[PDB]
């Protein structure tokens, strides 16, 4: 309850959150870097021209 | 009673220290995040030198 050194629930939460946060943030951040390209924003305008 | 009074003062100090320590550990975690960010910035500067 007080959280001795290897209290299985608390220790597991720590180890999972290390993976969980790093992976998810990497994917969002690298996804925004891959999506940063100006020509891709031009592809949204192109999709507008194409549908019209 | 005299022994209890002397012991009580020591106990109060210990309790105060523990409370301070709890505040301190949280601050240390925050410091690590700040430290990590500056290191990343330094690495970027190194890349410019390579160019």
């Amino acid at each position: 309850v007080r959280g001795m050194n290897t209290s299985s629930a608390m220790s597991a939460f720590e180890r999972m959150e290390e993976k969980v946060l790093m992976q998810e943030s990497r994917a969002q951040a690298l996804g925004e870097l891959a999506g940063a390209d100006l020509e891709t924003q031009f592809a949204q305008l192109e999709g507008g021209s194409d549908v019209d | 009673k005299a022994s209890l009074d002397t012991q009580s003062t020591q106990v109060e100090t210990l309790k105060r220290n523990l409370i301070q320590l709890e505040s301190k550990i949280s601050e240390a975690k925050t410091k690590k995040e700040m430290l990590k960010a500056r290191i990343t910035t330094a690495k970027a500067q190194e890349q410019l030198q390579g160019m």
Binding site: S25, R26, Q28, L30 | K36, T40, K43, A44, Q47
Partner: peptide, 27 residues
């Protein structure tokens, strides 16, 4: 050509590392 060719390969890998660092900062 040899001095120039080696440099081009090296700069690209460095850029990828820099991007990862930026992502970490963003994270």
């Amino acid at each position: 050509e040899k001095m120039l060719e080696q440099a081009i390969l090296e700069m690209q890998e460095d850029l990828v590392q820099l991007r990862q660092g930026v992502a970490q900062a963003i994270a």
